[PDB]
RNA sequence: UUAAUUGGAUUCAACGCCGGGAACCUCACCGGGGGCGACGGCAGGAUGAAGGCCAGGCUGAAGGUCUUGCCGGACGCGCCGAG
């Protein structure tokens, strides 16, 4: 219980596995996305992760495609996302494969509440507007 | 190319796929039996399209 | 088409007249291809009908291109005195080099006379 | 706007122009001299220039 | 950023203590001398001022003691907003 | 509360109302990127303006710019008024 096993297959046991034999080990949504092909932008992004995986492209990977499905290629490195105004780092670990990329870059600031004002109740609605 | 930055995209569904044939707005458009007009223009052109109000 | 600091040979005047005033009547009938580096490819093919190469251009770097391409093609041509009637012979008001136009119509006897004169003169 | 149309290798007595014609369009229009491919400039061509 | 009635020109900050009557407002500013604000006629219609409303006024170079004049009010979305910037210290309102 | 949480309507006669069941568009809102001056005159222009591309950087992605050099054949927001 220190190694990670997804469906009985270790990381480097599945790291060399294919992409059509892979999808039988993912839930519906990701199996279907892997079956209607990848979008053009995600092609352009995989063709920048693989270079950054061999020896080249030692430069921060950025993106707008929050839809990309994490895969056994991306385990280990640290890529960015775009949560609306800025690029936020997501250090990819195992136990993320299957989830969505944008799933880890939240998008609305947590809310903390002040105090009710003029109109929050029927006792301060017409007693203010004269 | 300066013709690649003022040119739109060819949608084929969603509110932005159809516009009124006479006014030019997206939104509440009539698609019954084919004619494609606003809900506002169909009301002030209908009695010339043949329609009548019986009840 | 050098600058007059290049003693190739002389310049007669009937040639100047019947090939420079022979452009207006030749522009209102056909097709003009002005400029120097515009026709170089068409004469490289051999498309030039009435090429009239100038003597106004400097420095001596892109001035001689048809004379060194002369001994490889046939080039029915003349020599040009100046530039004002050469831009104004067809088109615009800028310094012109070689209004080498294809099918100059209604102006063919001046060809039959002067093109062959400058043929049997030199090349 | 300067002046740039030259170096189409040329001397007196004979000529052998530097860059070839265009196989795509008619003859007369030249090619590139980038150093790795004859890009043909406008029509698209990457023969890894000879 | 934000458009707030900062001191522009020679403006003053009016935080009132009591309405003696007929429009006179005794104000308690960080300056010290008892100033007595009065009101123009453009706002006497659409707005509603009372005590505790830190607002902006304008003083007059005559005697610099009992002066001030409303030109614009403050809404509850600004009165305490103006604390974090420290543009005004609220302890000029509890002593 | 927020970078933005776009606006109009406040008794009857405002609140499943604007045919408003908004993933893109709709979109008017916050972050970023790029294009647009019919027409009269100005610096300039066939010794070649406006204007366009194989490949590579910057970039979220892009001949959008720059590297690289090819092409196209007359006009010109680099300047003023107008539209
Ligand atoms: Mg939207
Ligand atoms: Zn309509």
Task: Tally the helices of chain E.
Answer: 0
The set of bound ligands, ions and cofactors reads:
magnesium ion, zinc ion
SSE string of chain E, helix = H, strand = E? EEEEEE
Major sheet attributes of chain B: none
Beta-strand share of residues of chain B: under 5%
> Class by helix and strand content of chain E?
mainly beta
Largest interface: C-D, 14 and 16 residues
Specify the CATH class of chain B: Few Secondary Structures
* Spatial gap, N to C terminus of chain E: 31 Å
- How many strands appear in the DSSP assignment of chain E? 6
CATH architectural type of chain E: Beta Barrel
3D architecture notes:
This is part of a larger assembly, with chains A (130 residues), B (55 residues), C (123 residues), D (50 residues) and E (95 residues). By secondary structure, chain C is mainly α. Chain C has a single domain, classed as Ribosomal protein L30/S12 (60s Ribosomal Protein L30, Chain: A), CATH 3.30.1330.30. Chain C contains six helices and two strands, in the order H-H-H-E-H-E-H-H. Chain C is globular and about 35 Å long. In chain D, 0% of the residues lie in helices and 0% in strands. Chain D contains no helices and no strands. Chain E is mostly beta strands and 95 residues long. The chains are: A mainly alpha (130), B little secondary structure (55), C mainly alpha (123), D little secondary structure (50), E mainly beta (95). Chains in contact: A-E, C-D. The interface between C and D is medium-sized, with 14 and 16 residues. Zinc ion binds next to loops of chain B. Chain D binds one RNA strand of 83 nucleotides through loops. The PDB classes it as ribosome.
Distinctive features:
part of a larger assembly; 5 chains; B: 55 residues; little secondary structure; 30s Ribosomal Protein S14, Chain N; 1 helix; 0% strand; elongated; E: 95 residues; mainly beta; OB fold (Dihydrolipoamide Acetyltransferase, E2P); three-stranded antiparallel beta sheet; globular; binds magnesium ion; binds zinc ion; RNA-binding; rRNA binding (chain A); Small ribosomal subunit protein uS19 (chain A); rRNA-binding (chain A)
């Amino acid at each position: 219980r220190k190694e990670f096993r997804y469906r009985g297959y270790t990381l480097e046991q599945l790291m060399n596995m294919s992409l059509e034999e892979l999808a039988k080990l993912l839930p519906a949504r990701q199996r279907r996305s892997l079956k209607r092909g990848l979008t053009p932008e995600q092609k352009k992004l995989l063709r920048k992760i693989r270079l950054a995986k061999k020896g080249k492209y030692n430069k921060p990977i950025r993106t707008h495609c929050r839809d990309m499905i994490v895969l056994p290629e991306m385990v280990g490195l640290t890529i960015y996302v775009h949560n609306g105004k800025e690029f936020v780092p997501v250090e990819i670990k195992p136990e993320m494969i299957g989830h969505y990329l944008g799933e880890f870059a939240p998008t609305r600031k947590r809310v903390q509440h002040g105090a009710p004002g003029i109109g929050a109740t029927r006792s301060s609605m017409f007693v203010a507007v004269k | 190319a300066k013709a690649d930055y003022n040119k739109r995209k060819p949608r084929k569904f969603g509110k932005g796929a159809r516009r009124c044939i006479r006014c030019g707005q997206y939104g509440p458009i009539i698609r019954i039996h084919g004619l494609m007009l606003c809900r506002h223009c169909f009301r002030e052109v209908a009695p010339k399209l043949g329609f009548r109000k019986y009840e | 088409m050098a600058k007059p600091s290049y003693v190739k040979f002389e310049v007669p005047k009937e040639l100047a007249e019947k090939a420079l005033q022979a452009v207006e009547i030749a522009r209102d009938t056909g097709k003009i291809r002005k400029g120097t580096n515009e026709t170089t490819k068409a004469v490289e093919r051999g498309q030039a009908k009435l090429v009239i190469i100038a003597e106004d251009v400097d420095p001596e770097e892109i001035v001689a291109h048809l004379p060194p391409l002369c001994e490889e093609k046939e080039i029915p041509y003349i020599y040009v005195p100046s530039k004002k009637e050469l831009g104004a012979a067809a088109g615009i008001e800028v310094a012109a080099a070689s209004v080498a136009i294809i099918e100059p119509g209604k102006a063919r006897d001046l060809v039959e006379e002067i093109a062959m004169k400058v043929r049997e003169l030199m090349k | 706007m300067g002046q740039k149309w030259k170096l189409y290798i040329v001397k007196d007595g004979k000529v052998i122009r530097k860059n070839k014609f265009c196989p795509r369009c008619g003859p007369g229009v030249f090619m590139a001299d980038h150093g790795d491919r004859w890009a043909c400039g406008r029509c698209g061509y990457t023969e890894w220039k000879k | 950023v934000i458009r707030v009635p900062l001191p522009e020109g020679n403006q003053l900050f009016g935080v009132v203590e009591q309405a003696l009557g007929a429009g006179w407002m005794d104000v308690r500013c960080e300056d010290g001398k008892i100033r007595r604000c009065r009101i123009p006629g453009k706002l006497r219609r659409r707005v509603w001022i009372r005590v505790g409303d830190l607002v902006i006024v304008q003083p007059w170079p005559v005697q610099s003691d009992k002066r001030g004049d409303i030109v614009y009010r403050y809404t509850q979305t600004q009165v305490d907003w103006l604390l974090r910037k420290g543009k005004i210290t609220q302890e000029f309102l509890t002593g």
